[PDB]
Amino acid sequence: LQQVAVITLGIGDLEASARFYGEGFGWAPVFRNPEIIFYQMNGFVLATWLVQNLQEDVGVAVTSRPGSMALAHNVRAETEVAPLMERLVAAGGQLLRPADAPPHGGLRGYVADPDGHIWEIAFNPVWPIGADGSVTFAA
Amino acid sequence: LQQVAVITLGIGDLEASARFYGEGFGWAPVFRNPEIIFYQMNGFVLATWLVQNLQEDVGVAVTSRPGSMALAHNVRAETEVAPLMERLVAAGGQLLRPADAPPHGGLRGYVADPDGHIWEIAFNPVWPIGADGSVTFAA
């Protein structure tokens, strides 16, 4: 089945990460200990694990730097993009691209978390957002 | 709201990537063009976009190498971990860690896609998997 159970991001400091996701996104953890934090998302779990521990679990050297990837958070109105991005920046985020209209229409910007993981904050009215998140592609 | 709308992975070759996700995971795209492929997942969309295009959209230099992250796919029985991993490897995946029992119990291994993005194939009976994916953390 087409499923992702957990998105795990390697991080360097739990407090800094918790600040970004908690004070920036307004998310609350479902689990937390000195090495990992879990947030219940729309169909899966987001985990922020200290890099040393992630690397240890994989068994091979895993870089601490962000990679070729971006996670998008879609909002319900164009007026929500800018405000949310400001909140992320105020919570330790690094502004990468101020919100503007992408080729595929709508409005989107980019902000990276404290560890460099890229987040796209976007308004894309073409893709339905269900009652409890659940985003579905639509032509 | 606690939501991820899209997980975008930067890739170098669509055919190689499509082979891994299609022949390895058995997933089918909902959208595809010469630069990007979208797969409808459990509450969100997985996108594999040519790195040049991803970098262009963010506006800043974005590495082509994988980063400090891992995506997990949870199976419904311990006997499914090994077979699925073999299929991923046969589809171009790189075996990083043969399946074994992690500290938190269960069974899990790691295989990276053609571009280096790390996938954990795991059996974790403690976390419920709903009718259409939807994985939820449970103590």
**Resolution given for this structure, in angstroms:** 1.4
Three-state DSSP class for residue B23: helix
β pairing state of B118-123 and B69-74: parallel
Could you count the other beta carbons within 10 Å of the beta carbon of residue A32? Answer: 14
- How long a stretch of residues is chain B? 139
B88–chain A Cβ distance below 8 A for any pair:
no
- Please, are residues B43 and A135 in contact by the beta-carbon 8 Å criterion? yes
B36–chain A Cβ distance below 8 A for any pair:
no
User: Greatest CA span in chain A, whole angstroms?
Assistant: 44
- What DSSP state is assigned to residue B91? T
Return d(Cα B67, Cα B57) in angstroms, integer: 18
Could you count the other beta carbons within 10 Å of the beta carbon of residue A19? Answer: 17
Q: At A52, give phi and psi (nearest 5°).
A: -55, -45
B135 contacts on A by Cβ (under 8 Å): 3, 5-6, 43-45
To the nearest whole angstrom, how far is the Cα of A37 from the nearest Cα of chain B?
11
Return d(Cα B20, Cα B64) in angstroms, integer: 18
Three-state DSSP class for residue A84: helix
β pairing state of A6-11 and A45-50: parallel
* CB-nearest partner of A58 from B70, B117, B135: B70
Which residue's entry shows tokens 């492929």?
B37
Q: Looking at chain B, which residue has its C-alpha nearest residue A43?
A: B134
- Please, are residues A80 and B18 in contact by the beta-carbon 8 Å criterion? no
**DSSP string of B108-135?**
EEEEE-TT--EEEEEE-TTS-EETTEEE
Q: At A45, give phi and psi (nearest 5°).
A: -115, 140
CB contact under 8 A, B97 and A59: yes
CATH of the domain at A101: 3.10.180.10
B56–chain A Cβ distance below 8 A for any pair:
no
Return d(Cα B100, Cα B55) in angstroms, integer: 36
Three-state DSSP class for residue A32: strand
For B70, the domain range is: 1-139
- Please, are residues B37 and B48 in contact by the beta-carbon 8 Å criterion? yes
Distances (CA, A) of B100 to A122, A139, B72: 39, 42, 15
B53–chain A Cβ distance below 8 A for any pair:
no
Which residue's entry shows tokens 């969309």?
B45
Edge to edge, the sheet with strand B36-40 lists: A94-100, A107-112, A118-123, A69-74, B6-11, B45-50, B36-40, B31-33
Question: B109 — alpha (psi -120 to 50), left (phi > 0) or beta?
Answer: beta
Return d(Cα B13, Cα B31) in angstroms, integer: 16
Q: Which H or E run contains A100?
A: strand A94-100
- Please, are residues B64 and B37 in contact by the beta-carbon 8 Å criterion? no
Three-state DSSP class for residue B16: helix
Q: Give the number of domains in chain B.
A: 1
Long-range pairs for B34-38: beta carbons < 8 A, 24 or more residues apart: B38/A137
Give the N- to C-terminal CA distance of chain B in Å, as an integer: 22
